[PDB]
Design a protein around this motif. Sequence first.
Motif, short mmCIF file in Angstrom:
data_model
loop_
_atom_site.label_atom_id
_atom_site.label_comp_id
_atom_site.label_asym_id
_atom_site.label_seq_id
_atom_site.Cartn_x
_atom_site.Cartn_y
_atom_site.Cartn_z
N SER A 13 0.65 -1.17 0.12
CA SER A 13 0.19 0.23 -0.26
C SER A 13 0.59 1.08 -0.17
N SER A 37 6.82 -9.96 -4.61
CA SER A 37 4.86 -10.62 -5.00
C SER A 37 4.50 -9.98 -5.72
N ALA A 104 8.67 1.00 2.45
CA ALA A 104 7.40 0.86 2.40
C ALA A 104 7.45 -0.64 2.77
N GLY A 106 6.38 -2.89 4.91
CA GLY A 106 4.85 -3.35 6.20
C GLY A 106 5.79 -4.35 7.37
N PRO A 261 9.79 -6.62 9.35
CA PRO A 261 10.12 -7.79 8.30
C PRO A 261 11.61 -7.46 9.10
N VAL A 263 14.33 -8.13 7.98
CA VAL A 263 15.86 -7.68 7.08
C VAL A 263 15.48 -6.16 7.66
N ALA A 307 -5.41 3.49 6.23
CA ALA A 307 -5.95 4.72 5.73
C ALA A 307 -4.68 5.80 6.89
N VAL A 309 -1.53 4.76 6.89
CA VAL A 309 -0.89 5.09 5.30
C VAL A 309 -1.05 6.08 4.32
N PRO A 340 -12.33 0.80 10.77
CA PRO A 340 -13.73 1.03 10.25
C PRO A 340 -14.36 -0.11 10.92
N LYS A 378 -17.08 1.56 3.89
CA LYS A 378 -15.91 0.15 3.99
C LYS A 378 -15.97 -0.73 3.10
C1 LIG Z 1 -7.40 -8.87 8.36
C2 LIG Z 1 -7.01 -7.58 7.70
C3 LIG Z 1 -7.90 -5.97 7.58
C4 LIG Z 1 -7.44 -5.42 7.89
N1 LIG Z 1 -8.38 -4.10 7.85
C5 LIG Z 1 -7.84 -3.09 7.50
C6 LIG Z 1 -8.61 -1.73 8.14
O1 LIG Z 1 -9.84 -2.14 7.91
N2 LIG Z 1 -8.30 -0.51 7.87
C7 LIG Z 1 -6.79 0.11 7.40
O2 LIG Z 1 -6.90 1.21 7.39
N3 LIG Z 1 -6.66 -1.09 7.66
C8 LIG Z 1 -6.24 -2.04 7.64
N4 LIG Z 1 -5.40 -3.59 7.49
C9 LIG Z 1 -3.95 -2.88 7.53
C10 LIG Z 1 -3.23 -2.23 6.11
O3 LIG Z 1 -3.55 -3.38 5.35
C11 LIG Z 1 -2.32 -2.23 6.29
O4 LIG Z 1 -2.18 -1.10 6.93
C12 LIG Z 1 -1.52 -1.48 6.09
O5 LIG Z 1 -1.36 -2.22 4.38
C13 LIG Z 1 0.21 -1.16 5.38
O6 LIG Z 1 0.28 -1.15 4.11
P1 LIG Z 1 1.80 -1.41 4.13
O7 LIG Z 1 2.72 -0.38 2.69
O8 LIG Z 1 3.06 -0.54 5.08
O9 LIG Z 1 2.25 -3.10 4.32
P2 LIG Z 1 1.75 -3.67 2.97
O10 LIG Z 1 0.88 -3.29 2.27
O11 LIG Z 1 1.28 -5.28 3.60
O12 LIG Z 1 2.99 -3.91 1.83
C14 LIG Z 1 3.89 -4.75 2.39
C15 LIG Z 1 5.37 -4.84 1.11
O13 LIG Z 1 6.20 -4.61 1.33
C16 LIG Z 1 7.04 -6.28 1.10
N5 LIG Z 1 7.94 -7.00 1.49
C17 LIG Z 1 7.99 -7.74 3.00
N6 LIG Z 1 9.26 -7.79 2.86
C18 LIG Z 1 10.23 -7.28 2.02
C19 LIG Z 1 11.65 -7.61 1.42
N7 LIG Z 1 12.16 -8.24 2.47
N8 LIG Z 1 12.31 -6.68 0.26
C20 LIG Z 1 10.38 -6.98 -0.29
N9 LIG Z 1 9.77 -6.26 -0.45
C21 LIG Z 1 8.99 -6.82 1.00
C22 LIG Z 1 5.65 -7.10 1.34
O14 LIG Z 1 5.62 -8.04 -0.49
C23 LIG Z 1 4.35 -6.16 1.02
O15 LIG Z 1 3.28 -6.79 0.08
C24 LIG Z 1 -5.91 -4.86 7.71
C25 LIG Z 1 -4.88 -5.56 7.91
C26 LIG Z 1 -5.20 -6.85 7.75
C27 LIG Z 1 -4.60 -8.36 7.33
#
Ligand SMILES: Cc1cc2nc3c(=O)[nH]c(=O)nc-3n(C[C@H](O)[C@H](O)[C@H](O)COP(=O)(O)OP(=O)(O)OC[C@H]3O[C@@H](n4cnc5c(N)ncnc54)[C@H](O)[C@@H]3O)c2cc1C
Lengths: 406, 405
Positions: A13, A37, A104, A106, A261, A263, A307, A309, A340, A378
């Motif tokens: 995200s 991925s 970013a 995650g 993670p 790393v 959100a 993010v 939500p 939502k």
């Molecule tokens: C069941 C569930 C329900 C949720 N409901 C909500 C909701 O209602 N509202 C809300 O705001 N949020 C919700 N979330 C959370 C929301 O999805 C995350 O907060 C958001 O995705 C954070 O984004 P991010 O970019 O930090 O991580 P992510 O979107 O998880 O992406 C991180 C990426 O990093 C990649 N990665 C990992 N390790 C490495 C590496 N070593 N090298 C390269 N790439 C790597 C992964 O493959 C992934 O694609 C929910 C999550 C879950 C699991």
Amino acid sequence: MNHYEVLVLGGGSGGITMAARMKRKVGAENVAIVEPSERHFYQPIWTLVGAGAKQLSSSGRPTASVIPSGVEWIKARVTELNPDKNCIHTDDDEKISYRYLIIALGIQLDYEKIKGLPEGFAHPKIGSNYSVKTVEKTWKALQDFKEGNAIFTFPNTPVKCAGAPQKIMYLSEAYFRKTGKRSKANIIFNTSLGAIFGVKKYADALQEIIQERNLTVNYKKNLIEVRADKQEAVFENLDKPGETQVISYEMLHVTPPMSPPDVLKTSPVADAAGWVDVDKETLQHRRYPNVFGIGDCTNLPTSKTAAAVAAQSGILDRTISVIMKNQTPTKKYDGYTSCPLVTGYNRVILAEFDYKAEPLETFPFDQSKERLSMYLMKADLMPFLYWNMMLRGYWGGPAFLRKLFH
Amino acid sequence: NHYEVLVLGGGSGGITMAARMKRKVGAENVAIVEPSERHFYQPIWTLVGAGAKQLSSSGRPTASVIPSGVEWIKARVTELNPDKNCIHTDDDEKISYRYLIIALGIQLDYEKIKGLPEGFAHPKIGSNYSVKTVEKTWKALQDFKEGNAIFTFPNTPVKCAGAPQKIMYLSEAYFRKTGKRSKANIIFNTSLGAIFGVKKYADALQEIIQERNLTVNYKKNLIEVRADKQEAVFENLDKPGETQVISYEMLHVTPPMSPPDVLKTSPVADAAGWVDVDKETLQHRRYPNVFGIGDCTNLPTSKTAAAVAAQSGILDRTISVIMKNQTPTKKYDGYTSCPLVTGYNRVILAEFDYKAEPLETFPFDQSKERLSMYLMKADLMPFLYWNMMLRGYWGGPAFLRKLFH
Ligand SMILES: Cc1cc2nc3c(=O)[nH]c(=O)nc-3n(C[C@H](O)[C@H](O)[C@H](O)COP(=O)(O)OP(=O)(O)OC[C@H]3O[C@@H](n4cnc5c(N)ncnc54)[C@H](O)[C@@H]3O)c2cc1C
Ligand SMILES: Cc1cc2nc3c(=O)[nH]c(=O)nc-3n(C[C@H](O)[C@H](O)[C@H](O)COP(=O)(O)OP(=O)(O)OC[C@H]3O[C@@H](n4cnc5c(N)ncnc54)[C@H](O)[C@@H]3O)c2cc1C
């Protein structure tokens, strides 16, 4: 080495969003994304996928589909980060240098820290909405549930979307009431926390739901083992070390322990706990001025949600932009986030707060009320705007709509 | 090569457990993996920083504490593959074990504070947690003329959580014993919301904080040190985004701490990087031939050498009854001690277990500032540490307490 002006670690995200935003600042050809991925998921919707209300397939698109046009996708994994040499290592045995770095990556799921997991998921009656491999398993367990205990867990680690572990519980309860099963289900929440939520307004609302729906919440219980063949579960009493509790389950929903993670855990960009050590207000790294963090991998003392993010991305865009002109950043992230809270197949308590864990509602009506408007938002409006305006780079804080509504 | 019992670490627990395993399986089937030439009794480092004891008396060569006939593999663990019952060391070895005792301690992360470890090249700033910085504390105490004396506490687990405030009480004594108290603003800036987590000794410490004009600022965590300008920067943990820059005439750092890096990503850790052991037997929750002891574990008690001692007796019994294909029975109560030094002359000896409740060895009241407890901490415990504990003969203080009651 291979070199990019802006290097984005992660194609989730925050990654896709910051890359989209940076494309328009520096040219697409000077941005790269490192991501292993092939699928990009709007993970929020997995809550309704686990409850049978929405379909898994809709939750994803191919990473290529959402990479902003002309941006380079390095399909690989990051294996080292040398910020002092302005480079990183990938599992392709490449070294990539950057001028600016956006981390970013995650948060990490750690099912294996539960004894008998991830193996136990080959058995029935056990699901977890947190992983593409186990979410439909939640739903199937909910369908096959005939009689007994339905247990929902919350671990002793940081998590993303802290509301989702109870969200599925409310949906399971309502599924039971709409199928004539409610009478034969004893629904348990064993959380590692001492409260049902951190913001008192919504905590009170959820509590009223707990009482008016015969829901049992055991605080400071932490799941440590699963014996799926026996359909048993083992929880530890955090308040009294040594104590374990073996309990039978007809349906089990696991929320796995989570962590930064692997790393980052040892990277110089982390703080002592493994997270990206960023200034709390600008998202620039505290020790490496050309490094930035966003989203779940950071040490932003707020909820790890998408959100968050979106709000962060608007801040970090401005931070990076002015840093590029050698000026000092001015705009300050407020900690905005939102959960939500789905309380039924037709109702959401839209929880929105900030760094001070105080309400910061966008709409002028009381969002602590179970609302239908919020459920539809939502389940249907947010996924659409995620794909079509957040990942293209056009959704930041809801501060303007919040002011617009007052 | 292969060993019946492999110990990871040659500090307190490693040496202790290695001594104990020698009498179980024979010295020839035990080995200690450790990279240091020197083994320190870290508790006394508190008195070194106050100038009361000497840094040389606090360590000995690692060879001198290895039990005779036990192999010392001078390397550092770089990987643990428990699913294959093996580890990798930085000299590119692979070492197989029947049983594993992980005793790798806690890791100091000074570099997470911007400005450190570099700023220790400057004066007015020290830290008692590092053999490279503990004597700088003493000199910062001597060189002190006028201003703030800051003592910090990070937003991480730490070892001897009482130590960060010990050196403050000591400094307050030193300042009064040199005509400098009147010109010293002594503040303790902690990440925590409490002076101490056991009410009985907290209350004791709070009376001392009030009776000696010590201010305690809670939820303030150090994040930067400009030794050049003698400024420290704290974040307000209660108000994310909020900071405060403070000048210092003396700065004592307690550094953020964390599990050793090799453990952080290891399959033997929990999600937070600690050795995931049973809370009563110190056998690993998921690998039955792996055991943990001391700071590196996730044992929910205070990481202290006293805790190691009690743990080492239980771990000894746990490992012996497993070799006999029986299930363990004796359960660790979480004992740990913190001998809170409150001056060059007194010590509040805090002893407690898993329930954060007092579990005192002696029949009198240990909340009181006692001379005897000072001489125990300063002279006996070191003597007993080298001469009984590292040889395997001190464990729980269970019977000693039963005796006096
Ligand atoms: C069941 C569930 C329900 C949720 N409901 C909500 C909701 O209602 N509202 C809300 O705001 N949020 C919700 N979330 C959370 C929301 O999805 C995350 O907060 C958001 O995705 C954070 O984004 P991010 O970019 O930090 O991580 P992510 O979107 O998880 O992406 C991180 C990426 O990093 C990649 N990665 C990992 N390790 C490495 C590496 N070593 N090298 C390269 N790439 C790597 C992964 O493959 C992934 O694609 C929910 C999550 C879950 C699991
Ligand atoms: C200033 C100070 C004061 C203290 N005061 C007290 C007190 O009054 N009372 C008390 O009970 N406790 C006290 N302690 C606590 C005590 O020092 C520790 O809790 C105790 O030493 C824990 O022992 P350990 O075996 O867990 O680790 P340690 O004794 O610290 O040693 C761990 C060992 O692991 C080794 N190691 C690390 N990584 C690797 C690797 N990758 N491969 C191989 N070897 C490795 C290290 O070199 C080290 O030798 C104090 C500590 C400090 C710093």
